[PDB]
């Protein structure tokens, strides 16, 4: 018994995200996570500023892990 | 933001439940748990015979713990 | 924002389940549902008559719908 | 008979919040909501700017409604 899940309000890519297309990426997290779907949210490299905005297109759970596929809709402080 | 919760489908009272009225009890669990509300579910003393059926009337989270108030709607193998 | 989900404790196949292998099936539900993972639960044709027991191996969300892949571990009243 | 809940990442007080002490308020929402606990989040009057930061101290569910008690830790654009 006991179905544990984690609710996330932000996409934090530890530089481990993978692009499968032009603006859509995939991120694999440990544990069963719940991410707002179709809703725009903040994306960042580290838990600590803002790297951009994105919207999860798909979310799946399998073997204690969760992998999301999101569409990056904008970049924040893009230097230079 | 790393908000962990546990989903429970059954009420497991380690004999630590407290009755506040005639058929309604209160159970305190460790961690923020999610219990089906207004929905009837099984209640047992341990992981090892159905003790009855109940329905959560109230659920609260506070200081890493969760305390529920349920209404016992029936008893199972009530021995003589 | 507002991220709505539904917590299910049982697998109710309206006869709309599809087997992709020998004992593993796939069921598509409306809305983003949360099902206990790796945990055994009851499976029935309708909300009325247990058909068997199963365990969800994978769960995914996409376009307001949820599709689960479960492994049937046993059959209940298998008539002859 | 599913168990529907809504995940919120921000406190949106439609001007319907009530203070029970000096810096702690209480907000009643429709539906069973899940709010990050002990974790600081943004608070605003409407879904439109930032009114301050707060941290939920208690959360309860009862009769399809949810009422939270949060501690306001700071004010944003406090005019004058």
From Swiss-Prot, chains A, B, C, D:
Name the domain of life this protein comes from. Bacteria
Which Gene3D superfamilies is this protein grouped with?
Hypothetical PUA domain-like, domain 1
- Note the SUPFAM superfamilies from the entry: PUA domain-like
**Database matches in Pfam families:** DUF2584 (PF10763)
Name the chain's protein: Uncharacterized protein YtmB
The organism encoding this protein is Bacillus subtilis (strain 168)
């Amino acid at each position: 018994m006991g179905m544990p899940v984690e609710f996330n309000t932000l996409i934090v890519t530890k530089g481990k995200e993978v692009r499968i297309d032009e603006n859509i990426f995939t991120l694999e997290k440990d544990g069963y996570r719940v991410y707002p779907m179709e809703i725009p949210m903040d994306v960042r490299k580290t838990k600590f500023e803002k790297s951009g905005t994105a919207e999860v297109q798909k979310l799946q759970w399998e073997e204690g892990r969760t992998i999301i596929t999101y569409k990056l809709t904008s970049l924040h402080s893009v230097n230079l």
